[PDB]
Structures are given as structure tokens and as C-alpha cells.
DNA sequence: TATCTGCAACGTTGCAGA
DNA sequence: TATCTGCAACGTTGCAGA
């Protein structure tokens, strides 16, 4: 029963290959055949069969997620799926979920990609400065669109949170709140975000005039029990911190725990700076200065790079870069 | 120049059907031409054509999740995405992901996948008590699996979390902390586990002998920027309950919200247990009490399930409730 | 017997004609 | 010329035959 070329070539008598040049744009057929197979087509609900598609043309029309299975607490890796979906769902696109369990294994799943060739397009985060799955694909002519910049001399499709900005934006409240000494739950130095928020952040103490209290003994990465018990003596040496901006809200939560457990109340003691990926940390602590990251609309804009990039459309059109903008919650 | 059966076969040089037929341990390939199969086909190293292959067999090796766009905020569904692949992982099968956005257009992703067969197995969220979803594939005979129960007389693989025992257990632990004034957070009457939340609850305040504060004035897909005045509101009020259960730590978070804006401390005055997707509300509420709800552990047998079920398993062995945990 | 083998076909499209 | 169309093949397996 499910209508297939040969099904809409029978009803119209006309020739399956007719139907096939008919159905997608061609000069060959003429109008009013066209129009007549356009139009049968939509009425029984013909869609292409997508295994005889992809038997005898390349396309896949599958759109691959690499998803590293450690992420953040509060992540919301979810919201990215549907940002995508939302965008695939006008087009002839799927969405399959390849997961790694592990940096070590970052560059599997995209070998059985390419080997395979079981996908158009390919959408990856946690890029690296020099990362390698960024030059396989270039070089082996993937089509793929990163969360992330990378820093190797590539330009590819892209779509990143301004966390540059947004360290420099951070301190600003904080010097707007007086506080003079400040630190950073700066990203791993592995990954590319890592500088950009180090370069904020720089920026941020030289022009706000600022001091720069320094920690080195913990990362966004760091366990989170590990970051409360942390969290907590800072607060009992001499000195403690006036400022503290995270680049993390899932690390954030763990240190606020140890603050209170140290007994500090923010505001008053301590205001923090902390960016978060949906709206949800002003409920439990609303003097904590937020800004979201709104990353199904990365999930939307990662899409519609691809698909461009899928097209044709070259790489440095495609890149674009996401401001902060400072959460409806926030002092 | 990626290597297929018709390559194999030009080197060994074989026929294609002994190439294919060796590759799967069939008894007509001899044992020496199978090694000599085996072996360069390991070493090219040959992947079968999924199109090939699905084209020619029914058999699309595609399992599809079909997700509510909207979710609580907490429910981290990311959680439960790798639950399930990582039971595909061994497997043959990949994970495309479907999703609706309207809650009529709760069925139009469903006919998708059977009128196109786009699909081995599906996997849905959110049930209903008679859900249109769930007997559709039942009476079309495509295997699936559900997060939740239902209740249409029909038997079908499913994994829900035992929310009738979550429920009289919330009740126990509120005696514990001595608070003789209850209330209870529930579900849209739209969705099952409405009724075992409410049965394992009412039957856990006769037994308990403690009261129910009423409140039926909210439920948990309120929105959080409302349900916070009524936390406020409440408390604020001639009679403020002396204990109060949450099946989302998604309305959990927002009702505290209005619990310190009108001021009482939890822990001393209150004390509240909720349920967790993951152990997140302990970093933000020391004394809350909670209970774990491990999602990706759904996400696994709701996939072990479903695996079973599409070998054509029986329904009824394919059923599994988890007992809540009280965390760390 | 053991052990191998071609044909035919799933739905689509490129190419060479009609 | 201007539209139309059959043949073949993409890779795979069930099947009969040897």
C-alpha cells in the first residue's frame, strides 16, 4: 500500500523515470507533466523510500550528534537536540545519536562515520585548540559544523558562545558591585574556550582596574564534591575572594554549597558572576548575576550551518558567535 | 573503493553469495573458506551496507526516541539518551531521535515512523492512561517500549519508576520529621501515574495517621514563574502545612523559591521530600530529602526492553518497575 | 554427502536513447 | 527539437540448482 515511483508512474501511466525527473527539478520533463506528477505525489503522501535513495545515491539524508557520554551537570544537552530537530524538521534530514564514552575514544565514532559514510553532515563539541577530528573531516571532505572555534588555521562552520565577552562583561557587574578581588573557574586547557575566557577575563581586571585573586588547584571539570570541600575553606584562610566568575553553572552550584557550609552569605560577602544554560539558578540563590546561554538556539544555528554547508555554501560564511545577554533574574 | 561483498569475492576469489553466506556462519560454507573469509574481510576491513541490506531485508537496524519537546526543565533527558545507546553500543542498531512540538501533534511523529518504516523499534515518554500511541503500534504490531504505564487494558514492554511505593514512602519519612500537615505535588490528571501517585499517597496518610493539606490549586506543569507566588502565598498565610511531597524536582526548586521570599527555613520548620532524575538538589538544598530516580538506568532497560521485544520476546516479560533509592 | 553458485529483486536514479 | 522512456546498477539476501 505505501506509494512508491512505480505505484505513481502506474496511476499516471506515464514512465518511473518520468516520475523520478518529474518529482525533483528538471528542464527534460515538460510542465504540465511535471505539475501532474507534483501534484499526485503530494496527494497520496509519497516519501522516497530512503534505503533505495541511499543504494543508489550517495545521500544519506542523515544529520550525525557526536556527544562526548561526560557532560556537565546542568548541560541541558537535551535543549540542543531539539534546537536541531526543530530546524531538521522542514527537511528530509534525521537526527542519529553516536555517542564516545571518553576522550580517549573522540576520534571513533567519526572514523565509523567517514568509513561508513553513514551520514551527510556531522556536528561535534568540545573542540580542542589543535583538535584532530576538526582536520580528518576537513581533509577527508565532510561536511560537519563545530561547538566551538578551533585555533589550527581552518575555517569551518561554527557556532560558539562569546565567552570572551562574556568574562570581560562578568567582572564589570563585579566591579559595579565594588567587589576588588576576583577570580576565575576557568575550562580545562585542553579545550579552545579555555583562552577565550582567560582573555575576558584579563582584559576584564586591566580596564575595570581590578585586582585578580588567583586559584590554580581546581577547573569547571573538577569533581563537584571535590569543588564544595574546595569551595568551603576558601572563605577560612586570611584571604578570601571578593569576586568569583564561573564559566560553569554546574561547578557553580558546587561552590556555593561549601560557601554556605563555610557559612557566607552572598551579596553581602561574595557576589558571584555565573553563566548557565537554561534559566534555572536565580530560584534557589537570585543574587548570583546570570547570563544565559541559550544553546537550543546553538542546537538551531549549529543546524542551519550544516545544512548550508551540506549545500555547498562555503565555511566563513557560515560561522557565527553568540553574545551574552544577561539573565530576566539578575540584580 | 570501499570494500563490499562483490570486492571480497574478486579477491578470494569467491562467489558473492559464499562471501555473504560465510561472513554470516552458515553450514554451506565450508569451514577453511570461511576463515579465508573471515580473515580478509577483518582485515579490509568490511562493513555491510545498511542500505543494501535494508533495502533487500525489512530489517532498518534504526531505533526511534520519540521525545515530549517539552520536558521539566530537570528531567535530564540527555541522561536517558546514553541509558539507551549504550545498550546499542554492542549492538547493530543506531538512534534517530523524533520529535513533536504540540501536544495534538502528540501521535504525528508516531504514523511517521510506521508509514514510512522508517523504523525497528520506538521508544515514547509521557503516557497516558488511554494514549492513542500505544495501541496504535499495538494493533499495527510494531514493537516499542514506554517510559510509564498505561492504563487501556493493553500489555506491552514498559519501564516506569514505582511512584504508588515513592509515594507511601514520602509519607513514612514525614512522620519521621513529626509534620502533621501534608500536601502533595501531582501530575496533569492528563497523564496515569497521576493515580499511583495519589493511591500510594492517600493510603500512605490513613496508615501513616497523619492529615493532608488539600492543595489542589497547583500542579506540576505550572509553570514554575506561578507556582512560585503560591509558595510564597501559602506560607504567607492562617495555615501553612507542616510537611509537603514534590514528584518533580523541577517544581520542587520553584515552590522553595517562594518558601524563602515569604521566609521559612526548610529543614526546622518544613521538611520536604521530592523525587530526582539525577542527584542534583542536595548541592542546592542540604536538608531536603530525596529520593533518586536514575534516568539513564530507564534509558538502558527502556532499550533492553524494546531489543527484546523486536526478536519478538513476549510483552509481559518485557515489564519493570524500579523501587526508589534515597541517595547520597 | 560437502560445498559452492547464478538469478532475481527491494526502490531509486544515471545514461543512452525513443 | 522537445519531451518522454527502458535499461542498468547501487549492495544485499532468499531461492533453486548442482
Known sequence: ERPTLKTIAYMTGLGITTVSRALKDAPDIGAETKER???????????????????????TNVIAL??????????????????ITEVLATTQYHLVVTPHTHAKDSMVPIRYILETGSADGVIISKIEPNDPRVRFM?????????????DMGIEHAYH??????????????LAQCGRKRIAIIVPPSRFAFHDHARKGFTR??????????????????????????????LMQSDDRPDGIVSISGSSTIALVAGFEAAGVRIGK???????????????????IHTVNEDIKLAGRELAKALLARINGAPPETLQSVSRPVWSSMAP
Request: no cysteine; glycine share 8%.
Open 269 to 287: 560577602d561574595i557576589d558571584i558572576v555565573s553563566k548557565q544554560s537554561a534559566e534555572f539558578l536565580n530560584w534557589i540563590q537570585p543574587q
Open 204 to 233: 576584564g581586571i586591566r580596564d575595570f582596574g581590578v585586582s585578580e585573586f588567583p586559584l590554580d588547584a581546581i577547573t569547571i571539570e573538577t569533581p563537584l564534591d571535590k569543588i564544595r570541600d574546595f569551595g568551603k575553606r
Open 66 to 83: 557526536v556527544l562526548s557520554v561526560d557532560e556537565e551537570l546542568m548541560g541541558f544537552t537535551s535543549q540542543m537536540v531539539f534546537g
Open 160 to 173: 560558539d558562545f562569546d565567552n570572551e565577552a562574556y568574562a570581560y562583561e562578568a567582572v564589570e557587574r
Open 37 to 59: 506528477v507534483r501534484l499526485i505525489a503530494q496527494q497520496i503522501g509519497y516519501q522516497p523510500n530512503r534505503a533505495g535513495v541511499r543504494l543508489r545515491t550517495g545521500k
Open 138 to 150: 576537513t581533509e577527508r571532505k565532510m561536511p560537519f559544523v563545530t561547538h566551538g572555534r578551533s
